[PDB]
Every structure is written in structure tokens, then in C-alpha cells.
């Protein structure tokens, strides 16, 4: 599903909706939502 | 932040003569003036590029990496 | 210089300022406050007064039930712990500045007291003094009776004693 990173452990996590907002690795409640895939265009200006 | 890659006022690149002014001031035990000198920047609007920069990058990495692989 | 007594010069007093900035600080005043309110103010808060006193009458209509109660409570010391939060779930664990400011929490550190729960009676004989004796009931047992904001830095914070490496390690600015 989507995947989040721990805030203290740079731990991969994919949750669904109705899963626990929860670090499986240690219990911290702060995630961070991964970088998305989509292309990202910058003017080197 | 980190060095500027060049001269705001004329366009000279000093970005690569940051670790060489380093090494100066700390291999050689140059002054400011003398070692400025060394690395070729004459003009003052270059002098204050280099001279007056403040490197916050590594305070910036004293912190863990959010997302470490 | 070789004398120990010379007179100094105009440039040593910015090393006395130097030593000043190193002992005290730029925002000592706060902590400084905020320690001597933990410390002692608190304590002379909760000991002066804090004394209710209940005393029930016999109102005897009868004299087989001459006896009057007398109900007190008082407040001992005060506990003041390390900031920690309650969860959803009711688990406690230690909270950090830097989990408060994301989580929109409050660095509250929880306060007990010793509550003191005495009691005295005496014999209603009408005429005779109301001599008030001690009935064993002198109970009291610290109960939660509040939670008190923790400014940072104070003596009662967990960055009091950290290192640089240590604000570092847990993402605090030094
Ligand atoms: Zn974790
Ligand atoms: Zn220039």
C-alpha cells in the first residue's frame, strides 16, 4: 500500500487505512509519507 | 549554507577554493589576507565571497538523516 | 603581566564579559525564575494554608449519641516529576520538546502531594469543655493534582543536562 518512513528509525512502512498510525520497530506515532515517483522538473535558473 | 559557486558582483568562480582556503588557514597557518591572495582572488567583491561565508551545511549534518538507506 | 597585581587594560574587561556570557547566559533571567518557583515557591504555596478543618457537631437531641467528630485535611510535600505524557491507550511514557512541538502536546511534568487526612472527637458533656482526642483515624499516599508547564532548559527538563552530542541526537538546535 502506502508507504510512510519512521521519524526515528528511517524504517520503511506500508500501512493501509485501517491499520494503527504506529512504528512496527519501535512504537513512534510520528510518520513521514515517502517521496512520490511522478517526475519532478526544476529550471536550473 | 554552503560556498557560493560564484562571485555575486563580477562572476568569478570561487566555489572550488573553499577546502583549498581551509587547508591554508589551517596546514600553512596563513593569514586571511595572505591566503585570499594565494588562491588568486585580487578583486574585494571575490575577497568578501570567500572571507565572510559562514558554512552552515555542517550543522545541517550533524542530524541523523530522515530517510537512511 | 609578570606583576600579579598590574592594572588591567581596556581589552581584558571583554574577557570578564566573556566569563560573565559563559556562567550566565542570554536568557538566564527565565530559567532562573522558573527554578526558584519549582523549587521552593511551590513547596510555600502548598504548606501555607491548605489546612480544611470540618468540625460536626454532636447535635445531640438525645444524650445516648453525645459524641462530636472532627474531620481535617492537610498537605505535605510535593512531587514534581519529568515531563511525561498520557496516551490514548493509557500507556505513560516520557515525552521530548521535539515530539510536543510536532504532536501539538504540552511539556507538562505531573505534580503529587502527600495528602495528611486527620481526624479528632470528642465527648459532647455539656458544661464540661468540648476536649478534642485523637480518634486512630490520622490517615493520609502522594494523589495527582495537576499537571505544571515546564519551560525549557529549566532544572526540571530533560535538555537541562545534555550535551551538544546529546541536542543533537534528539534534534534539538544547540
Ligand atoms: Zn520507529
Ligand atoms: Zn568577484
Known amino acids: ?45 | 549554507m554552503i560556498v557560493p559557486v560564484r562571485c555575486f558582483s563580477c562572476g568569478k568562480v570561487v566555489g572550488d577554493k573553499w577546502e583549498s582556503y581551509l587547508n591554508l588557514l589551517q596546514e600553512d597557518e596563513l593569514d586571511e589576507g595572505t591566503a585570499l591572495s594565494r588562491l588568486g582572488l585580487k578583486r574585494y567583491c571575490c575577497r568578501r565571497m570567500i572571507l565572510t561565508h559562514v558554512d552552515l551545511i555542517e550543522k545541517f549534518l550533524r542530524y541523523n538523516p530522515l530517510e537512511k538507506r | ?174
Open chain 1, 1 to 45: 500500500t502506502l508507504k510512510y518512513i519512521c521519524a526515528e528509525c528511517s524504517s520503511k512502512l506500508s500501512l493501509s487505512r485501517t491499520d494503527a498510525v504506529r512504528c512496527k520497530d519501535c512504537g513512534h506515532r510520528i510518520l513521514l509519507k515517502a517521496r512520490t515517483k511522478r517526475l519532478v522538473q526544476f529550471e536550473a535558473r
Open chain 3, 1 to 174: 603581566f609578570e606583576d600579579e597585581s598590574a592594572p588591567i587594560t581596556a581589552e581584558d574587561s571583554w574577557a570578564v564579559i566573556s566569563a560573565f556570557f559563559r556562567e550566565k547566559g542570554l536568557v538566564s533571567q527565565q530559567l532562573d525564575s522558573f527554578n526558584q518557583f519549582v523549587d521552593y515557591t511551590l513547596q510555600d504555596i502548598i504548606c501555607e494554608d491548605s489546612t480544611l478543618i470540618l468540625e460536626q457537631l454532636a447535635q445531640h437531641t438525645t444524650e445516648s449519641d453525645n459524641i462530636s467528630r472532627k474531620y481535617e485535611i492537610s498537605f505535605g510535600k510535593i512531587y514534581v516529576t519529568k515531563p511525561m505524557v498520557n496516551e490514548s491507550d493509557g500507556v505513560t511514557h516520557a515525552l521530548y520538546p521535539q515530539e510536543a512541538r510536532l504532536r501539538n502536546l504540552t511539556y507538562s511534568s505531573g505534580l503529587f502531594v502527600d495528602v495528611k487526612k486527620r481526624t479528632y472527637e470528642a465527648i459532647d458533656v455539656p458544661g464540661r469543655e468540648l476536649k478534642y482526642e485523637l480518634i486512630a483515624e490520622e490517615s493520609e499516599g502522594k494523589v495527582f493534582i495537576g499537571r505544571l508547564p515546564i519551560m525549557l532548559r529549566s532544572k526540571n527538563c530533560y535538555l537541562s543536562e545534555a550535551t551538544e552530542s546529546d541536542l543533537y541526537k534528539l534534534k534539538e538546535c544547540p
